[PDB]
Design an enzyme around this catalytic site. Structure first.
Site, PDB file in Angstrom:
ATOM      1  N   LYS A  90      -6.341   7.153  -1.908  1.00  8.94           N
ATOM      2  CA  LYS A  90      -7.524   6.935  -2.426  1.00  8.94           C
ATOM      3  C   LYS A  90      -8.520   6.479  -0.970  1.00  8.94           C
ATOM      4  O   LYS A  90      -9.728   6.470  -0.867  1.00  8.94           O
ATOM      5  CB  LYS A  90      -7.584   5.603  -3.281  1.00  8.94           C
ATOM      6  CG  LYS A  90      -7.300   6.237  -4.555  1.00  8.94           C
ATOM      7  CD  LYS A  90      -7.227   4.884  -5.602  1.00  8.94           C
ATOM      8  CE  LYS A  90      -7.089   5.251  -7.017  1.00  8.94           C
ATOM      9  NZ  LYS A  90      -6.221   6.729  -7.266  1.00  8.94           N
ATOM     10  N   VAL A 148       0.877  -1.106   0.177  1.00 10.19           N
ATOM     11  CA  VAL A 148      -0.024  -0.022  -0.107  1.00 10.19           C
ATOM     12  C   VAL A 148       0.947   1.297   0.101  1.00 10.19           C
ATOM     13  O   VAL A 148       1.867   1.184   1.143  1.00 10.19           O
ATOM     14  CB  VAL A 148      -0.848  -0.096   1.143  1.00 10.19           C
ATOM     15  CG1 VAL A 148      -1.905   1.354   1.234  1.00 10.19           C
ATOM     16  CG2 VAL A 148      -1.903  -1.390   1.275  1.00 10.19           C
TER      17      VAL A 148
HETATM   18 NA    NA Z   1      -3.440   5.221  -7.955  1.00 13.34          NA
END
Ligand code: NA
Ligand SMILES: [Cl-]
Ligand SMILES: [Cl-]
Ligand SMILES: [Cl-]
Ligand SMILES: [Cl-]
Ligand code: NA
Ligand code: NA
Ligand code: NA
Ligand code: NA
Ligand code: NA
Ligand code: NA
Ligand code: NA
Length: 327
Positions: A64, A57
DNA sequence: ATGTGAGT
DNA sequence: CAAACTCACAT
């Protein structure tokens, strides 16, 4: 888990978009891996920064996640879902044989619907034309009852060919499912092993026979070891014809057959638990073979297997009926 | 020979 | 289960 489903669904949807619509393989995997590491996380995620601690990540998914947690949506995704090109590409891609590449080429040419495709078969290969032809049929679930009829035809035609043939219908059907997507038959013959001379005719002869009896109706592909095509239950006289079904027939060496039947009976959760318990007992199991595991950890030389029972015995588990292979 | 594609 | 592995089609 459960816990972070909204975020994982978000990323699975971004992955699909990058694979099926952009053709950016690395972004697709980036999202897959992120969705996976997150689904493993024991806490309800509260910030992008918390998720960023997780390997896989990064900055952009953290951003997001922040937007998703704040508003409950993602503008990028809402745009994707409103986008006709994306919708069309995903639609075309439901025809077997049509993947993202063909899908782009087709939507670019204004071809977006079943009606459209049926007007442009000259644009399609054999596989894709078969897929268009039975688009509706291939999307229907198969009831266990028909699976059982189908299973008999192949098992019967196979026997009458050569009683030494072993044929097994796998997947969820074998675990007793009420319906099935398709039929996955694993086939073997005792004079076909891993230490032997490769014999395509063993498969080809049973395909040809199932064609003789008009059970197999179309071929998507057929090589020395793998057949993929279409079948249809016979209808008595006139009246209503049964739908066309997808069937695969795979020829496996006799000494790897039962690891095959096991692996491909599933479920995935059951396999995962099985191959993980096998580690605990000191064995690695894949679809082909069960091998011991030495003190170092790396080890091989397959153990002799001649039933699913044997594999269970090796890892000191009681045998589990396919009925009971949910987990 | 190699690459792209597709499905499992 | 993702990855590997088949096979089709092209060049
Ligand atoms: Na992205
Ligand atoms: Cl057009
Ligand atoms: Cl073509
Ligand atoms: Cl079934
Ligand atoms: Cl199994
Ligand atoms: Na595309
Ligand atoms: Na990655
Ligand atoms: Na880092
Ligand atoms: Na498909
Ligand atoms: Na035309
Ligand atoms: Na199946
Ligand atoms: Na095949």
């Amino acid at each position: 888990e459960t816990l972070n489903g909204g975020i994982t669904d978000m990323l699975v949807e971004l992955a699909n978009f990058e694979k099926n619509v952009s053709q950016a393989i690395h972004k697709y995997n980036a999202y897959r891996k992120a969705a996976s590491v997150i689904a493993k996380y024991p806490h309800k995620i509260k910030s992008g920064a918390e998720a960023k601690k997780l390997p896989g990540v990064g900055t952009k998914i953290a951003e997001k996640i922040d937007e998703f947690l704040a508003t409950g949506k993602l503008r990028k995704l809402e745009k994707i879902r409103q986008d006709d090109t994306s919708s069309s590409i995903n639609f075309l891609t439901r025809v077997t044989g049509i993947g993202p590449s063909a899908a782009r080429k087709l939507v670019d040419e204004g071809i977006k619907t079943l009606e459209d495709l049926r007007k442009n078969e000259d644009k399609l290969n054999h596989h894709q034309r078969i897929g268009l032809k039975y688009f509706e049929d291939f999307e229907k679930r198969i009831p266990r009852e028909e699976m059982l009829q189908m299973q008999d035809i192949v098992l019967n035609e196979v026997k009458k060919l050569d009683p030494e043939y072993i044929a097994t219908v796998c997947g969820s059907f074998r675990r007793g499912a009420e319906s099935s997507g398709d039929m996955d038959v694993l086939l073997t013959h005792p004079n076909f092993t891993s230490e032997s001379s490769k014999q395509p005719k063993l498969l080809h002869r049973v395909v040809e026979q199932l064609q003789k009896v008009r059970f197999i109706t179309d071929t998507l592909s057929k090589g020395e070891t793998k057949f993929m095509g279409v079948c249809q239950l016979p209808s008595e006289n006139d009246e209503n014809e049964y739908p066309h079904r997808r069937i695969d027939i795979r020829l496996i060496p006799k000494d790897q057959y039962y690891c095959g039947v096991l692996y491909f009976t599933g479920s995935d959760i059951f396999n995962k638990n099985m191959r993980a318990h096998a580690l605990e007992k000191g064995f690695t199991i894949n679809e082909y073979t069960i091998r011991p595991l030495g003190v170092t950890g790396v080890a091989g030389e397959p153990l002799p297997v001649d039933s699913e029972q044997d594999i269970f015995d090796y890892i000191q588990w009681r045998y589990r009926e396919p009925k009971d292979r949910s987990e």
